[PDB]
Amino acid sequence: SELISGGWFREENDQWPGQAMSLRVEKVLYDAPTKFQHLTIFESDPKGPWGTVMALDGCIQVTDYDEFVYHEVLGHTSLCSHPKPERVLIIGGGDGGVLREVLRHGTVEHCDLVDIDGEVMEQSKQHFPQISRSLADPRATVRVGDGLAFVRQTPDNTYDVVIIDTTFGEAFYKDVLRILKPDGICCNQGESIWLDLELIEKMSRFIRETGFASVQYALMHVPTYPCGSIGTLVCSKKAGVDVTKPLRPVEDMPFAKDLKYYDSEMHKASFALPRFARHINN
Amino acid sequence: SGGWFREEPGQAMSLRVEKVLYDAPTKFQHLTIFESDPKGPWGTVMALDGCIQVTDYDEFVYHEVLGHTSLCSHPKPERVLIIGGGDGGVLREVLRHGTVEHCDLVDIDGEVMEQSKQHFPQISRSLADPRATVRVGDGLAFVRQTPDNTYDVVIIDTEAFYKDVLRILKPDGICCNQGESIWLDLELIEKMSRFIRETGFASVQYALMHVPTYPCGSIGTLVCSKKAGVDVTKPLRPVEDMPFAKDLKYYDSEMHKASFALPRFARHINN
Numbered sequence: 250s251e252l253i254s255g256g257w258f259r260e261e262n263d264q265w266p267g268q269a270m271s272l273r274v275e276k277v278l279y280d281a282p283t284k285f286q287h288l289t290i291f292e293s294d295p296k297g298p299w300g301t302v303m304a305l306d307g308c309i310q311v312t313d314y315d316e317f318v319y320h321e322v323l324g325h326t327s328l329c330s331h332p333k334p335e336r337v338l339i340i341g342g343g344d345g346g347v348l349r350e351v352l353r354h355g356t357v358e359h360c361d362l363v364d365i366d367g368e369v370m371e372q373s374k375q376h377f378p379q380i381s382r383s384l385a386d387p388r389a390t391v392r393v394g395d396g397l398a399f400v401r402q403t404p405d406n407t408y409d410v411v412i413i414d415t416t417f418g419e420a421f422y423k424d425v426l427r428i429l430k431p432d433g434i435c436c437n438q439g440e441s442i443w444l445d446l447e448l449i450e451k452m453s454r455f456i457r458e459t460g461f462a463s464v465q466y467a468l469m470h471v472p473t474y475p476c477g478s479i480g481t482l483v484c485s486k487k488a489g490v491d492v493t494k495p496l497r498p499v500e501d502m503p504f505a506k507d508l509k510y511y512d513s514e515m516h517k518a519s520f521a522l523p524r525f526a527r528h529i530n531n
Numbered sequence: 532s533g534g535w536f537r538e539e540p541g542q543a544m545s546l547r548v549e550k551v552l553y554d555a556p557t558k559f560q561h562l563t564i565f566e567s568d569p570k571g572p573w574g575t576v577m578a579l580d581g582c583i584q585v586t587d588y589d590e591f592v593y594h595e596v597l598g599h600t601s602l603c604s605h606p607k608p609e610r611v612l613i614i615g616g617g618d619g620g621v622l623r624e625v626l627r628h629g630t631v632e633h634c635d636l637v638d639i640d641g642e643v644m645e646q647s648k649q650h651f652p653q654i655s656r657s658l659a660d661p662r663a664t665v666r667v668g669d670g671l672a673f674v675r676q677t678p679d680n681t682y683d684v685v686i687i688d689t690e691a692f693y694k695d696v697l698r699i700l701k702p703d704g705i706c707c708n709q710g711e712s713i714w715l716d717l718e719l720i721e722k723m724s725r726f727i728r729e730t731g732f733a734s735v736q737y738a739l740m741h742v743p744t745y746p747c748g749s750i751g752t753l754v755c756s757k758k759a760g761v762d763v764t765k766p767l768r769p770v771e772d773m774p775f776a777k778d779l780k781y782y783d784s785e786m787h788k789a790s791f792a793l794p795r796f797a798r799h800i801n802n
């Protein structure tokens with residue numbers, strides 16, 4: 250009801266006030282409130298590199314340009330930290346990007362994807378076909394529902410990996426821990442080390458107190474995020490496992506040469522944090 | 532416009548202006564200095580020709596990376612040259628090294644350092660250091676009039692020029708320059724990298740850093756070596772052995788190594 254072709258999309262929020270990042274709108278493809286959140290999709294300036302942009306509640310979540318960074322990091326940092334990931338769960342990820350990356354792994358026999366907003370996937374199918382192609386994969390079962398409810402009703406020792414593609418109390422992470430198998434790996438999108446370092450520390454310790462043996466924060470270069478860097482918490486249920494070094498190097502996989510960001514050297518480097526934030530990983 | 536500093540094709544990044552401390556064209560460029568929103572973390576902001584160059588918040592990232600990645604790649608950096616860096620941030624980091632006996636800093640705009648003294652006192656403090664000699668002049672002209680084998684490290688905080696940089700460096704000399712973004716101008720990085728190599732430098736490696744104020748949230752630096760067989764991607768001398776290691780807010784040896792791991796789309800820059 251607002252965004253007009255030729256106008257400018259303006260991203261801005263609290264926690265980080267007195268700052269704004271704006272993108273020119275070439276064409277508004279979708280702009281309306283869904284049952285759960287406000288979904289905005291528009292074509293960015295053709296002379297710029299971003300292409301099609303998706304925003305949720307005013308926050309950019311997907312762009313054609315840097316899309317691969319976040320999806321490869323979440324998908325591969327987690328699965329390459331697992332001895333043999335066969336059954337995988339994705340909470341959120343309706344766009345299908347993380348799913349696409351998880352499906353590259355031949356070890357994966359099945360992946361369950363549970364996103365609460367069915368309109369996110371519908372609009373992703375229409376305006377991000379190269380990302381959402383994964384949603385129709387035989388090895389994928391896509392559910393439209395709450396992930397909190399899903400994990401609570403999932404039996405013990407079901408999944409090898411749980412990827413939480415959504416920025417969720419203690420009952421939820423207790424559920425994530427219990428639904429994972431003994432060598433299970435949990436993955437969540439973490440906050441920025443710049444605009445909310447304090448919440449990362451809290452989330453990191455809270456996840457460990459829930460029962461997970463270890464948690465490590467991985468950093469990534471994603472240009473569309475306010476400070477140009479989001480991260481991801483890679484947690485481990487099993488004790489005595491170092492997720493900072495690739496358990497199975499992706500170079501041994503055939504799809505290794507198809508990735509645009511991730512490789513074993515990026516994996517290692519992602520867990521190297523600036524001195525001011527180093528204490529998170531110790 | 533109304534209490535909002537905007538930067539830059541079909542995109543823009545804006546900051547609210549709490550108080551304008553300085554805004555005028557100098558002899559060489561337009562210098563803007565303002566206090567950002569107090570409820571935000573940026574603090575005092577400096578922009579040159581509309582481009583943010585220094586903010587209180589992330590200032591340390593760029594200055595530590597340029598200063599320490601270069602010096603920690605040198606066996607014994609005693610004489611150092613800094614072209615640009617009038618704010619004094621890189622100089623401050625260079626001066627942390629006890630091996631450094633002298634540092635020459637040459638910035639073309641004297642008003643940049645004057646305004647840095649006033650509005651960035653904790654950064655520009657280094658400019659008055661005994662081991663520092665600060666010159667107001669063109670670095671192109673300076674390096675061409677500098678004798679051969681003068682410096683251990685040259686930091687460019689900004690063909691005849693890089694020929695001069697190569698010549699004025701001693702045999703195990705290390706050159707450092709600010710590189711472009713791997714996102715918004717990857718093609719220029721490759722050109723610059725090859726061009727520096729064909730000038731005569733044995734090796735060149737691009738280091739990546741997390742700097743939140745830059746358009747895409749990541750600028751980089753080219754660290755180049757005059758001597759062949761030198762791998763700058765691993766610290767020659769870990770900073771952990773120096774007494775100032777714990778004073779650094781960004782740089783350490785693990786970050787040093789991590790900085791040269793590039794995304795696959797940009798890996799051809801480092802081979």
Ligand SMILES: C[S@@+](CC[C@H](N)C(=O)[O-])C[C@H]1O[C@@H](n2cnc3c(N)ncnc32)[C@H](O)[C@@H]1O
Pocket residue numbers: 305309310311319340341342343344363364365366369394395396397414415416438
């Ligand atoms: C669009 S993705 C954001 C990831 C993005 N790539 C980024 O950089 O952060 C977030 C998705 O999580 C979903 N989601 C939000 N709350 C949820 C919940 N409680 N259960 C399951 N999915 C949820 C939303 O529908 C949304 O599509």
Ligand SMILES: C[S@@+](CC[C@H](N)C(=O)[O-])C[C@H]1O[C@@H](n2cnc3c(N)ncnc32)[C@H](O)[C@@H]1O
Pocket residue numbers: 579583584585593614615616617618637638639640643668669670671688689709
């Ligand atoms: C402020 S620094 C930029 C570094 C900054 N920390 C950043 O984030 O990119 C740029 C300085 O280089 C100086 N400069 C520009 N051209 C120069 C030249 N030809 N010779 C010496 N200094 C020059 C400018 O006067 C300016 O002070």
